[PDB]
Write a protein that binds this ligand. Structure first.
Ligand code: NA
Length: 152
């Protein structure tokens, strides 16, 4: 089962991820998109500073204008790289969602609402990730984690 759970956080949320992001690690984020949303993002970061801004290994950015999309990217030394855009977005204003990010050796895999959504190859070594940030127009119900070290 998921552990290290956070309930109903204030957004923006910035929290230390409780263990290393080894292959098989799961980050599970349940929430809903508010009626007025333009975009939100989930960022897996190397550090927590907002200024100068911490590197973002994996930026997962649902956008809601027109037909919507999900933009993924990486921020290194305050510069964004090439966007990878997934156009068939499952997210909808006023609807709840579950995001499951799984770390693999060479990429992240993301499923939304129980269906595979996208892959994103590592551009920063995942061992450098220590922080989860959630920003923008989104209402988070819970955040939970699964690590290979979890006891039960
Ligand atoms: Na940003």
């Amino acid at each position: 089962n998921l552990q290290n759970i956070i309930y109903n956080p204030v957004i923006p949320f910035v929290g230390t991820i409780p263990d290393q992001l080894d292959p098989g690690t799961l980050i599970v984020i349940r929430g809903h998109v508010p009626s007025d949303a333009d975009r939100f993002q989930v960022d897996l970061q190397n550090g927590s500073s907002m200024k100068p801004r911490a590197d973002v290994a994996f930026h997962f950015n649902p956008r809601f204008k027109r037909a919507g999309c999900i933009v993924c990217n990486t921020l290194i030394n305050e510069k964004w790289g090439r966007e990878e855009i997934t156009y068939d977005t499952p997210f909808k204003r006023e609807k709840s969602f579950e995001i499951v990010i799984m770390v693999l050796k060479d990429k992240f895999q993301v499923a939304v609402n129980g269906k595979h959504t996208l892959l994103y190859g590592h551009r920063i070594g995942p061992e450098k990730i220590d922080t989860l940030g959630i920003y923008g127009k989104v209402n988070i119900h819970s955040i939970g984690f699964s690590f290979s070290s979890d006891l039960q």
